[PDB]
Amino acid sequence: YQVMKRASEVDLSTVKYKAETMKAPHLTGLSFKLFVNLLEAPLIGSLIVDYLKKDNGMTKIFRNTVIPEEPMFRPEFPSQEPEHDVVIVGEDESPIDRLETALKCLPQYDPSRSFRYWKIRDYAYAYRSKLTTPLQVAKRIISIIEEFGYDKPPTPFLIRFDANEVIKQAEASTRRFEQGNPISVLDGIFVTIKDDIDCLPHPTNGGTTWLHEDRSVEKDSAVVSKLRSCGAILLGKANMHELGMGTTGNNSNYGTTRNPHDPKRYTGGSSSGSAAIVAAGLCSAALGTDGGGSVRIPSALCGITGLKTTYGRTDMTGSLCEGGTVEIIGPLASSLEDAFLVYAAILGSSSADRYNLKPSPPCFPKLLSHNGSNAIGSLRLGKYTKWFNDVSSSDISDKCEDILKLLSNNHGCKVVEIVVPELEEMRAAHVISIGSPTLSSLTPYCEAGKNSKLSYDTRTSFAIFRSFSASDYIAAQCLRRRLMEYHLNIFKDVDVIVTPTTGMTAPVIPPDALKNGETNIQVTTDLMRFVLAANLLGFPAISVPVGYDKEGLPIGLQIMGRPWAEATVLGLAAAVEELAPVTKKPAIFYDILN
């Protein structure tokens, strides 16, 4: 008749791992479009959705279960014990000043590195040694984009690109290097911006064709304004899975961005273009949003570093997901050092988040690791083995287990077996928590006739989101509190939680799916198996490359840490990067700086 729970009294020894995959048929092309027309049909559409929610257990969770916890509408963090062996940064420092402090946290630059990706400090040294100039690098990047059509269908990196704007900024940066006063280590560094983040002079479409018609861009987002103040060069707007409602990167409007390691495979989503352009070496870094693993997933599949920061750590003003409760804006880069430097530039809460969320002052890790590494070795690594191993290929669990052994051997890290209850409830709570504000912010435009302009993938999701009731939303926030309590208790015993980033490597794109998208829940299920807690509960998490599977496809490891502990997850990731450097040059790669 009805079931009941309670979180603080749950016997953790009785918690069982729930392994059943959400099952649904894979649809592409005409069958997919007919299915969406059925979903949007006045009467039978609701009937279908109600059957889907009853079959996957969401109705039992939202409507047939007594939940004793009060709702947690946004991540609520208790005071955390201060991090160990970190540098405390002022809360109201400028990005320029934070970059000066960030350089002091890195090992001394050795001009012997100028396969290995180029680093931000390699560019910065080349600009200052007049070995090259930002204008020349810009011409080289502009040449490659125009030659291969990376700003055009059918496989673009960028869906908004103004070569004159890029030349304009690069000339101003070159002039500052010629005059001998660069703004910072980021002066002249090229950064790509995901199309759900505002970046002048470009419009923001979120991967749609039409959003610019209804939402204009008057000023830079907070993250872009901070990068621009450092002298960084904004390259353009990156392709993405439409409005963040996907984890593959499939885009019917502009074409699907291809994985540089294998152009027949997906990049991962939704920050598809951002990850690909960095993996190909065209630009140093990119910014992306992560609401459902949207930064970490494509970073893992494309073999780069993606950092998901604590909820509210980085001001999201000027983006399509501002006001959301699961999303962040984070960096993607081809090395830990580069991702750390971009984080130093963009971090900083909005004024409202500063009072509401009460973050501890940002901290930087000491990556020069001497005196070291007593800090890394004292870290306790939580492993949920049944969860850790639930992957499609043993290559993934093998490669990530090897990294844990390497950390124990070289530093002394202790791996602690943990249990994470109610992963099924977490997925249900996350989908309605990310989908309700996304649908809500677009509902006036869609009610005004623009719903048919969306892709069939988005329209499938929106048909599901429209069936979520307000009372469903309340119940899901009560589940958020349950999962927060479970994770905070785990964080009493361990410092981080380690998993593979994804349950599969880069999947091949079904050719029939390029025409008008697809629905393939079994693929989206494997891709989101490990990432959702960082979003529903707000913890920071990073994806760091740790090798390749039998077919040479990159494998990612996820380190999720305590609230506001980016410095901890960054330092542990730097130790992982020491033990597992990225060695394979991607099939699609460009050696700028030559």
Binding site for its own copies (CB under 8 A): 1-3, 43, 62-66, 69-71, 73-74, 76, 78, 214, 322-323, 352, 355-356, 432, 435-437, 439-441, 443-445, 447-449, 465-466, 468-475, 478
Q: How far apart are CA 343 and CA 581, in angstroms?
A: 21
Distance separating alpha carbons of residues 279 and 124, to the nearest angstrom: 20
Q: How far is the CB of 467 from its own copies (least distance, A)?
A: 8
Least distance from C-beta 393 to its own copies, angstroms? 36
Query: What's the rounded Cα separation, in Å, for the pair 470 and 542?
Result: 33
Q: How far apart are the first and last CA of the chain?
A: 70
CB of 588 to its own copies, least distance (A): 39
| Residue with Cβ nearer its own copies (279 or 536) | 536
Alpha-carbon distance values, 261 to 173, 515, 519, 520, 543 (Å): 32, 23, 24, 22, 17
Concatenate the DSSP letters of all residues of 78-131 into one string.
Answer: PPPPPPSSEEEPPTT--HHHHHHHHHTTSPPP-TT-------HHHHHHHHHTTS
| Contact call for residues 92 and 362 (beta carbons, < 8 A) | no
Q: Alpha-carbon distance 589 to 594, whole Å?
A: 13
CB atoms within 10 A of CB 209: 16
342 and 378 Cβ atoms separated by less than 8 Å: no
Torsion angle of C-alpha atoms 96, 99, 104, 110, degrees rounded to 10: -110
- Helices 336-346, 120-128: crossing angle, 10 deg rounding: 80
The answer on whether 291 is annotated among ligand-binding residues is yes
Would you say 4 or 19 has its CB closer to its own copies?
A: 4
CB-neighbour burial class of residue 450 (10 A; exposed 0-12, middle 13-18, buried 19+) = middle
Residue placing its CB nearer to its own copies in the complex, 103 or 474: 474
Annotated active-site residue in 53, 173, 184, 194: 194
Q: How far is the CB of 425 from its own copies (least distance, A)?
A: 15
- Residue 453 Cβ vs its own copies, minimum distance, rounded to whole Å: 14
Three-point CA angle 543, 505, 194, nearest 5°? 55
Task: Tell me: is residue 330 an annotated ligand-binding position.
Answer: no
449 marked as part of a ligand binding site: no
Closest to its own copies by CB, 323 vs 412, is 323
- The least distance separating its own copies from the CB of residue 535, rounded to whole angstroms, comes to 16
Shortest distance, CB of residue 146 to its own copies, whole angstroms? 37
Using the minimum distance from each CB to its own copies, give the nearer residue, 124 or 439.
439
Residue owning tokens 């589940």: 479
The pair phi, psi for residue 468, each rounded to 5°, is -70, 125
| Given the residues 221, 225, 270, 373, the one annotated as active site | 270
Q: How far apart are alpha carbons 186 and 120 in whole angstroms?
A: 7
Counting every residue written for the chain, the total comes to 594
**Closer CB to its own copies, 63 or 176, in the complex:** 63
Alpha carbon 330 to its chain centroid, in Å, reads: 6
When the beta carbons of 197 and 523 are compared against its own copies, the nearer one is 197
CB of 205 to its own copies, least distance (A): 17
Comparison of 478 and 531: residue with beta carbon closer to its own copies:
478
Catalytic annotation on 194?
yes
Listed in sequence order, the residues at least 6 apart from 138 whose beta carbon sits closer than 8 Å to its beta carbon are 166, 167, 169, 170, 190, 233
Sequence-separated (6 or more) residues with CB below 8 Å from residue 444: none
Whether omega before 270 lies within 30 degrees of 0, making that bond cis, reads: yes
User: Amino acid identity of 8?
Assistant: S
Catalytic option among 294, 334, 397, 455: 294
Say whether 294 is catalytic.
Answer: yes
State yes or no: 90 annotated in a binding site: no
Residue numbers in the known binding site for substrate are 291-294
Q: What is the set of active-site residues?
A: 194, 270, 294
